[model samples]
Target chain A: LCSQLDQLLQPERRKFGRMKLLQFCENHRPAYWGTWNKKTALIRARDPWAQDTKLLDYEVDSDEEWEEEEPGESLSHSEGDDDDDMGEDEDEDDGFFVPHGYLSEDEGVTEECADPENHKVRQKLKAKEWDEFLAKGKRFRVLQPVKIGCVWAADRDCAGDDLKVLQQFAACFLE
Target chain B: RDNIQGITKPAIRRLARRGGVKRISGLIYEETRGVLKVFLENVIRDAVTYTEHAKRKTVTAMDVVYALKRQGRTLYGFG
Candidate 1:
């Protein structure tokens, strides 16, 4: 955006909003022009910068929370505890709720159903659309779920205050 | 006609660049590939069916989400 400003070149500093667009087109021309040359090595066949996208994560609190609560306790990180922390604001979204109409016509029947065979046909019809949509908006909103740092120890039964600390740590994250 | 829906090719290029360096679901390289493959296998059952339309730039994220919503599928690290 700063490049759009033409004040430096013109002593009078005449305002030219269209100049911004022209300037942008000027600077960006090379990249698009490169794209025009399909055979150009710089113009990759697909997304050149494609890389693995990272997820959101919560940082661990104080070192004091790093101790072991229990000698032996194992829990999968995938399963989030069903607590009051996870609340739903049903009315949060003011607009743009997706409708059920966009699904493929062949879609129906689940694997667990009396016949899992129908699942295959249904999927075949919807795969492309589904993949493309996700590809486009996958970056629009990043759902960052960091390691909120587990209890100092779960088996030993940490005190309520310690648990409070964890919550506070997470709360502080928002700020 | 534009090659993408609601977004131009240049915009997509920028998004791709930003997203490339940026994180998605806290996954990198192999992990992301795993997640994408899983999501594609389970979610994109009809990709071939839509490629014809996609050739015309008719396919869109709306098309994909619409399909996934029916199956009650959602991905982690991607809102």
Candidate 2:
């Protein structure tokens, strides 16, 4: 859980070079490039309340939920989640900032990368890779959790709850 | 050199794909086509003269491993 909390803040840690699509609109009042124009409207359209300040809240499983999901799967469901029995009543609130998003809307891949219409092109190839991993679950997919505004939600909800959870998760990945 | 250009190691390996050569010694990256000719010559000499065609019988993935091993190399990707 702590590692998920840390991963959730990865975007916020990248504060230097990060800029959203709207930065283009407000900065360049004159020039509107092909994809940039489409992206700005899409970003604002998707995140109408992006300007607002609100904390995310979530109630994590206290004890048994940990036991169930502890022996979790690795890349494949067969891998299973491993839970370290801490036994202490840990906090279940997670909160953090939403980092960067590759696409303003991910129902479709970004036009900047590939011609989405053509299946034989690079976009289709990436889509296949994404689909294969997403088959495992969205928690593995880096974008959806960030997009849903619940990334740091895991942090504030259950920040520093269990280092063992993240430790095992990372260990499973290396294995 | 031109004689061995089209018959290079990688090229012969590609050709071996049709001849059922699956694995190759990936340790030192033996990419010499001429080396294969010498290797095959030795194989033919031993197999035909000794009636030991056992090595040429099956073209399993392991067959390719031993064939490359005869050239003083180890198979890669086995680990």
Candidate 3:
């Protein structure tokens, strides 16, 4: 019971950037963007209430370097399709953004990317590699790059007494 | 530790005091926090699954309510 109260009283608030998302959103906007070569990708905030607001410009190391450095099952997900240098089967019009290392460079394959619809041709990442990529960079698929609103109810009511009870309830579990 | 993230001791003491519990042992406090973290994480994971199926970016209060309901505990006072 004490443990439950302890866990509840100090709920593990989701941290964004250096602070909390609840507080972060107070000052900054939700969505963020990164651009290169006239193309822009929407970078969703993990803590999205405008977390740390740092601009990261990490470069993808050369393919040969990656092969030499981390070469275990790197790009084994690629079907032996050694011909498509550019992912021509991919949707150029779908407005989707596929990140680097998502495509294998075993052959002269350049700008080769994957989409769910093109999974057959798409070079798949192992679960471990995928998790690493997700943790390091933003995954468009998991990030749900698009923004939408919350469900709304017009007749919600609350009094000071109700607010205090709610606060007390929250305080009970969160410090 | 390679476990679910949890709360700190100071916060637990502060909150417990507010609930009128004057004292709790250090050993039991740690165990309680660990258990609650796992339980909360499981419930929240299911809630996230529901949130993802709806294809929404944000996890709303409804997701938590629905998660509890799915786990055989229907909670009210949330929209």
lDDT of 2 by residue, A21-140 (tens): 432322213222232212333236678655432333243333422233332212222221232223344333321211112221222333454435443443565676578667757454
- Could you tell me the lDDT of residue A118 within candidate 1? 52
Per residue, candidate 2 scores C-alpha lDDT tens digits across B1-79 of 5544444344444554556532344332345555766877775554343333442321234545555566456866451
Report lDDT (Cα) of residue A54, candidate 3.
Answer: 42
Docking class of 2: incorrect
DockQ of each: 0.04, 0.01, 0.01
Candidate 1: regions farther than 4 A off? A1-61, A67-175, B1-29, B47-62, B73-79
**Which of the predicted structures, 1 or 2, would earn the higher lDDT when compared with the native?**
1
Q: Supply the DockQ value of model 2.
A: 0.01
Alpha-carbon RMSD of each model: 28.3, 33.2, 31.5
Score each candidate by Cα lDDT.
0.43, 0.42, 0.50
Least accurate stretch of 10 residues (summed lDDT) in model 2 chain B?
A: B51-60
By DockQ, the best candidate is: 1
- Cα lDDT of model 1 by residue, B1-79, tens digit: 6421332333333443455422122223345445556777765656434544555223446557655765687745334
Chain B TM-score of candidate number 3: 0.68
Question: How big is the positional error of residue A98 in model 3, measured in Å on the Cα after superposition?
Answer: 28
Question: For every candidate, what share of the true interface contacts is present?
Answer: 0.00, 0.00, 0.00
Ranking by DockQ: 1, 3, 2
Ranking by TM-score: 3, 1, 2
